[PDB]
Symmetry: D2
Subunit: 489 residues, 4 copies
Amino acid sequence: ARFEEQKLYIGGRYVEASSGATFETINPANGEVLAKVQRASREDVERAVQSAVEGQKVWAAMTAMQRSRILRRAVDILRERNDELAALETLDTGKPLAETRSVDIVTGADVLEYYAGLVPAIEGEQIPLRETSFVYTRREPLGVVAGIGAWNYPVQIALWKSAPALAAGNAMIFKPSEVTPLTALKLAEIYTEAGVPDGVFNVLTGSGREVGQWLTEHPLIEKISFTGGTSTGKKVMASASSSSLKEVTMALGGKSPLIIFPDADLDRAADIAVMANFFSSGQVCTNGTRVFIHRSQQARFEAKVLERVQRIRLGDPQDENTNFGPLVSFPHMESVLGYIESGKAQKARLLCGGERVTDGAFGKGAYVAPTVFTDCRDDMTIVREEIFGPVMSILVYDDEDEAIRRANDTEYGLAAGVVTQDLARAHRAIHRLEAGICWINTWGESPAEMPVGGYKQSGVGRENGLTTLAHYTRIKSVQVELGDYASVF
Amino acid sequence: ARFEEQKLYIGGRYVEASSGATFETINPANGEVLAKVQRASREDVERAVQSAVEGQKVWAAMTAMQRSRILRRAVDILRERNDELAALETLDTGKPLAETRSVDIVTGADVLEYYAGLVPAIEGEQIPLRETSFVYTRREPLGVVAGIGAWNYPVQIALWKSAPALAAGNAMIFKPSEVTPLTALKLAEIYTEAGVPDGVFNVLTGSGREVGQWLTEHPLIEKISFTGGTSTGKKVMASASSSSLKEVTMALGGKSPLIIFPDADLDRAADIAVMANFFSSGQVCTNGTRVFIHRSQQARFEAKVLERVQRIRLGDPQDENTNFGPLVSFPHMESVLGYIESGKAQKARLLCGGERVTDGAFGKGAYVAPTVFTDCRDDMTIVREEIFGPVMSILVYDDEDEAIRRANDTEYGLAAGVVTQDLARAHRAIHRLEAGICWINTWGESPAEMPVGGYKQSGVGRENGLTTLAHYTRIKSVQVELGDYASVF
Amino acid sequence: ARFEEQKLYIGGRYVEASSGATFETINPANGEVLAKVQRASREDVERAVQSAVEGQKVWAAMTAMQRSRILRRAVDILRERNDELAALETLDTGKPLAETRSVDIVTGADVLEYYAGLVPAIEGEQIPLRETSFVYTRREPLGVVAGIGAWNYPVQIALWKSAPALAAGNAMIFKPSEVTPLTALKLAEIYTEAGVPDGVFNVLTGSGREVGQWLTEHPLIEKISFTGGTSTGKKVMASASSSSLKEVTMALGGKSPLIIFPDADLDRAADIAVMANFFSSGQVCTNGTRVFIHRSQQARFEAKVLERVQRIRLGDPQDENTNFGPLVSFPHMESVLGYIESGKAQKARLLCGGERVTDGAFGKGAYVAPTVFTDCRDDMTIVREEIFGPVMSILVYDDEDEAIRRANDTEYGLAAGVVTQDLARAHRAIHRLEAGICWINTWGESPAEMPVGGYKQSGVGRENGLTTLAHYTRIKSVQVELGDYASVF
Amino acid sequence: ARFEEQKLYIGGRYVEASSGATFETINPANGEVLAKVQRASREDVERAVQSAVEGQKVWAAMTAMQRSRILRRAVDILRERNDELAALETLDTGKPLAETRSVDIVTGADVLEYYAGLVPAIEGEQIPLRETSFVYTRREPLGVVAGIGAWNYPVQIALWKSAPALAAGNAMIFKPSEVTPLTALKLAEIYTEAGVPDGVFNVLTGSGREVGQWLTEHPLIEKISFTGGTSTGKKVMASASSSSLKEVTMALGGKSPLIIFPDADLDRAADIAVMANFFSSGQVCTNGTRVFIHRSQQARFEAKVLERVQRIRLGDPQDENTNFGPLVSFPHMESVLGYIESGKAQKARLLCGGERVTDGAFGKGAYVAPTVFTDCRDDMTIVREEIFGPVMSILVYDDEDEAIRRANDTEYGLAAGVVTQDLARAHRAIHRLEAGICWINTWGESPAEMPVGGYKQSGVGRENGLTTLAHYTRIKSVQVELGDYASVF
Ligand SMILES: [K+]
Ligand SMILES: [K+]
Ligand SMILES: [K+]
Ligand SMILES: [K+]
Ligand SMILES: [K+]
Ligand SMILES: [K+]
Ligand SMILES: [K+]
Ligand SMILES: [K+]
């Protein structure tokens, strides 16, 4: 393998798993074996919980500003090591260096930095009842929480989950995707180097159906935060609920609508649509994979999309000039190609792409060309179902209410956006769209201040923003009686 | 039966169920049938959801103050009908008229009154990103939500759940316990009279295993709020999660500790201990059913409890002078009796009652005498398990830290209280107790302003307070891009 | 004297002034003497304060909800007597019944109703410092506060000032404009009748120079809320500050800009411009009295404004069909006529109006015709100074930056607005305008939820919204030390 | 002079004043002239204002996180230079190195650090009105603000004022007391070094006799933040209000009561009393200079107080072992000795101290002995008036209500404290004390999170805590009309 065997991270150091088993992590660009990685056993989970329990106490006993300084130091190290972490994330994900260097660690660290500053701002309430009684609330740490990560933005997700959890005084046990375990382990090292107490951020590697479930089932874990696909999230949430009634946050999939109204500048609209479909090779949960264009503008829009797609630079993710890499894995590629075949079979018109790229060195990896289908219909499989690949579906509409009705006609509801220059239309339409993440005249930006998450089957709870911090604490109400107590007995 | 057959409440009127089936609600004071009540069918649930979908739109389309006024009118009607409703509640629950007339509706309306005034205060956030871009959030209604009630405080719980739900612009379908269906239907009538649009508060009667489950499963319901036992809670939360990923609130059971410190006045202590154990005949989720007393004070304390318990006026709930009624149902009495026997079997010392009361008329009702066990041990079944009856377990401790640790040694975490006159000890101890509802030198008061709910397996989320109003809305983030859009492609 | 002599309102009833002096309130519609009004002496002020001090204790002694119900009761009475109060305001101000019936009491009561619902929501904070210490804050009433009203919206202003003050648990002493004393006295009666404790809302009539100054000087008054001209506002603030360091809030004058952008609908633009200049006969502080029109639209815009101005129904305020009445007083009419002459003298082109209306019975009243000046320059007196009458100044511009700089080029900064259909321009321009009250594609609406007040010379602090309620309490921080205390000595 | 001539700080460097005038700053330990210091001219104030106007634009055009990082960098430098700055502050104030090294810069930077983390948290509101219209608020910088510091904690106060001002995106022109100008100039160098843009923190030297008044009266300054005596505050606020209606925050003087209740540990109570009177040689606004002791304990309390006072280590501030330094200046010494005379003259019993210490070297300094008067009475000049020196007044009382009533009988209201072990009495008592800063069983701690400031003539507005940050922004409300506009004309 390229790297030495990856071990569990428990108690501020690497420790040996006790399962006797390992798995491999593969570079999607060339099929290379990056590392053997240990599978945590059930007993290893137990060890991580007890470690977390004890570390959480040390961490909560500090002052708010002491925690803040430690998380800020972690931010400082992340900025220093951005490029090195990016290179590793590229190996592990297949995503272009041009993305990992500018987005993944940058925005992951942005959120850690945001919450680090907010630690001292976590406050309870005080309410007077009468002269002889008042109540005050405490926002106490939950204690030990678990994060379960997805493979498309490994370290960024580890950061978005751990930042609020640690800032609120918790310990987090994090399980990266079996598909992408490498950067999560580096994060844990960096937390320790920053002065995060032993046990406060532990990492367990392995599968979702095993280690994931052992975490969601454990009676001492008070909250689960999960990122991934909707069907998986239902299982995770059921398990977290029936085991011990955990609090849960779910960031799931979607089939987000992008509505281009007739007064839109078509260049901006095309720029938005491509960015909404082909960043990270189309492997972004919030992608605008149903693009609605007015009948009167279909041809010109298509021409603009085509021009942009034809100049997309698919290639070796190691090459800085690349802006479009392979998919995360061969099995994911096969899934995407199946959707592409479905699109052809159901008679959607292929505007461009539609196949795997195998020329030269690309045969070694899992490269699917940026793909655009048009003349789509709402009942098509590619229009209804999340593909999580570089596959745009263009849909013609005739009026605004129709476009909106159709955009809303889905069990998903993660994101939505509109392109228009009209003041009234922009807000009116966005207010009617049933999604948690709404963009006007742009797409994809997810500022640390902005709470993000899904409506409907696209999520439970939110991430980022002030409010999320609050959801990593639990409220204790304390009523102080200063007067007499009356009994009816 | 005493009353006519109770029908479903859908769309601002009573409609016939389509199950062809009924159940009986039984006066626990005398075993008589109060009414036959229709069971909702699966198609009845579907009917109620479509009704709520349409009503919610009418409700949400009004202004904040319009909703506020309508809810305040409901409050006025409730105050008007306090005694009448208290009478119906007494029949249905067996609870003394002296409780229902002054607690149930009073505090139910209190919470509704609280939220009615807060409708105009529900706000989003605005966050500038840069000169050319900013974000605002909207707190939109979830849409259709469902409440599932417990039998100990039927109309109160229906009010605590429906108030924040409707104030936040939602429609609620509410399912009363099969045990106590009567007052919920009355509430529905009152809401309609008050001007609540048709379909905004619908009531479905029947069993949890059927209608309850049909509600937690339905794809169009966005949130479930449940009150009941932890065991049932787990199944309800699992179902709500895995079906369509609904948001959930769970107000569950407990085994709440009351720690009496040496410096406490033992009169207040005894008053608190008894109030925390025998009000509503011991059928309060937050009851302090593990009472910790210092060894040096056990004797004097037991004497004060006994004296108090011996003057408790058990009797007919219709008699204004009764302050201790029968239990809610015969099967429930049997369950409590079993627990009492377990106490006897496990060699806890009986100090009080410990048997059914059959003297004369009481033989026709489900009466259990106020019961105190002392000399208990943490391993006894009556100490580890929720009884939900008039059964106090007195436990002896030798030091503060020991007491606090043993109080925390439970999977429950609903309530906790201390009795002490020392400034430092009151706050110090309370901060260390793992429960969401904490009382100092008092017990039982639950002001509308105070967020209440459980730690650990005692619940998920909270009710009442400013915070709960927020959790009946979904956050939508809107990024407005006023400037150029950059694409990497 | 159509009405009897008006006395002071102290301690829940009318009482005799000890000044031996009175003044007359007129009726600008004809010349009538509506009534004689007592002048408060310095001793009456002292008396109103002691009354306020004792009433405030009673008011504050109540529960949040108790205060809430009482203020809600007052709202109910105000809705009942809307038309009656309106008729009285119409006599006392000259404002058309059409306005006073639909605006003055309606929106005055809106604000009171908004705040009544919010009483229970006033809360402090809780901040943990460390295991052995935490702090909580209380928001306590200031105590006794004073409101000084303006004459353009007498009862609405009394309501906007008293509502938040009373809701936060204070007593207010209110001083109406000498010009318009009548409706304030009625409001006092209405409060008392609703259950407001004696002394909590007292009314003192007389001059600003005297009783106004006596209020701002009193060492027992904790806060002053003032509405009027900027010149007077300066005097008032200096007095309130230098005497006893009172908290202060001031809503003052303006010369608010309205920018019509070249993409605007001219019908809407003209509607907005006329509404922004001629409602209440041009006696609104927030009026858009500098109207910027793009050169390309000037001719079409002037035509559209003229057509609307010419159909303005000036007339008897008593007639339901009147929508434009006399000014508030003859002296004020003279001031307006002076400004109008200034405009003529400096060679502004007169588009319409420009003189007193004396035909028929109108000659008995203080009627100035709807006046529009065009071809204005920024250094004209009518463009530079607040006229507070029916006089619109139209200013041509060539580009956005120019219009914005000019709009900002003033010591005022109360309000501003833009008319445009472009999403980007609407928000971009509004963000650059230096005013506290900004309207996009509308003008004049002032929701109870919306904080309003001026930038620069146009005011200090705000009215309405959640923020204003907070500013009628004072913050007390309480640090609870539960551990050891350390001295360096 | 020990140092070279001190210049003005404008635009990120030192510049020559244009007054032709200088003043001296004197080491109060030895009468040594530390430095000549230039006096800003009126044209210099103008120059600083124009510099701030331009710097503020650069500062406010950065992102929130950019501002945050720059303030965090200033924090790091302050931590680095803590001892160096402490040494210089000791020279300037005469305060013991043991104080300046552990309090002044530490707690100054604590507040800056606190606010640095909060920059991204400053948000507006969003309020929906109806489907076709909503409002959002912006929290915009005030622009240019002025801070006016006191001489007792020169650099700490400079930090406490500039931190929230800069965090909220303003520029601040700061005027240190002529008595202590040195460290503020260093602070300005440090901000510049951290990356604060030129003009954002400017420092002008001079006195309240000239530059103080030029700052407060300046038309382009939007807010004044002032710390000093109530008498001076009154003048300042009159000027700020009447010149251009500035917002004003004032932290003024006090005569803060410390109530020792009969159940208190007299050792703690004594520790508290001495800490509350002799830290910084009694030069602390919040000092508990009226100490209420119950008659039954007077004797014992005076003994413990005397015992502690006698072991106070008065001496050279340059010596680490010193914990009690000279006063800040010889004129201030004269003022204090005057009050001590008044004490003697009004026949209060002198328990200890009461004179200038002139032994050996101390003769060359401004040392006043730790002084305690007892058997005091409420009409005594030393009891009503702020001395701002080492002069404790002990007062006997008989019952609880009396102590409280007397503690509240003052025009002051800055701080208050109670010592007691009783839960009920602690909260009860503190809730009735009319002060903004209340301590239970401790004294003097002022956490960055705790809003602090005075009731009554002791201050206007607050410093520190979340709420203070909001007060360095101004609210703009924006109503967006998406629907039709309705005109009555
Ligand atoms: K991999
Ligand atoms: K959901
Ligand atoms: K029943
Ligand atoms: K839980
Ligand atoms: K009049
Ligand atoms: K101002
Ligand atoms: K000095
Ligand atoms: K004050």
